[PDB]
Amino acid sequence: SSGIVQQQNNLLRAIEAQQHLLQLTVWGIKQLQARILSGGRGGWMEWDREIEELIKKSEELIKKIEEQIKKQE
Amino acid sequence: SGIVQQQNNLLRAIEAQQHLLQLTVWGIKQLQARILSGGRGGWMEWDREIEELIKKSEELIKKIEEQIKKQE
Amino acid sequence: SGIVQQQNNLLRAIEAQQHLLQLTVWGIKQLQARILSGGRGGWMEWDREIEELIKKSEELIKKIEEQIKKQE
């Protein structure tokens, strides 16, 4: 059960697990930031922006890989 | 070069990023402890969601590592 | 798509997550600097470990992209 195909499927599951972890850490940072520094001064506004754009980019790629794997005919 | 060696390197990247993640979690927990005493405000659930995904992620990485070895 | 095209997409996913990790480390550092004065309490080693792991994984990521292109 250790072929390349299988390993690629497992790497994907690891990638998605870590993706979920990243969103959890982002949630935590926002909670702390909101309590310390209400308002986005010092670059937190561009930070929010970059995060949201990279989260979308990442979940899109994951979706696409999940589609490639299923696409097997 | 080749699919096998590229996969091993992908695993190394993911493993390095796993260690980075666990460091960032440590950082957040330290800060949260200082600003707010306790696990009120959602932090209890957060701690538990985090540790669940961490072990799951760790298991998959060890699993792939094993598959790579069994193939040799 | 095949294994080759999948690896390429996996790499892109990993590089996106590398940039995410860089952004979260930035946020944690901003917070720590505002709350705490020095590098006491483990933040000194945290900084060093973080920077090492960040360099190591982006080294691996850049290497893989190049290895793959060298396969043509």
Sorted by where each begins, the domain ranges of chain A are: 1-73
Nearest 5 degrees, angle CA C9-CA A2-CA A64? 20
Task: Please tell me the experimental approach by which this structure was elucidated.
Answer: X-ray
Please state which of the four CATH numbers 3.30.930.10, 2.30.290.10, 3.30.110.70, 1.10.287.210 is assigned to the domain occupying C1-72: 1.10.287.210
CATH number of A1-73: 1.10.287.210
From chain A, pick out residues whose CB is under 8 angstroms from the CB of B64. Answer: 7, 10-11, 14
Could you tell me the two tokens for B44? 């209890």
Angstroms from B33 CA to nearest CA on chain C: 12
C-alpha A69: how far from chain center = 19
- CB atoms inside a 10 Å sphere around CB A56: 11
Contact C27, B31 (CB under 8 A): no
Is the CB of A14 inside 8 Å of chain B's CB atoms? yes
Contact A61, C7 (CB under 8 A): no
Is the CB of B7 inside 8 Å of chain C's CB atoms? yes
Contacts of B70 (CB under 8 A, 6+ apart): A2
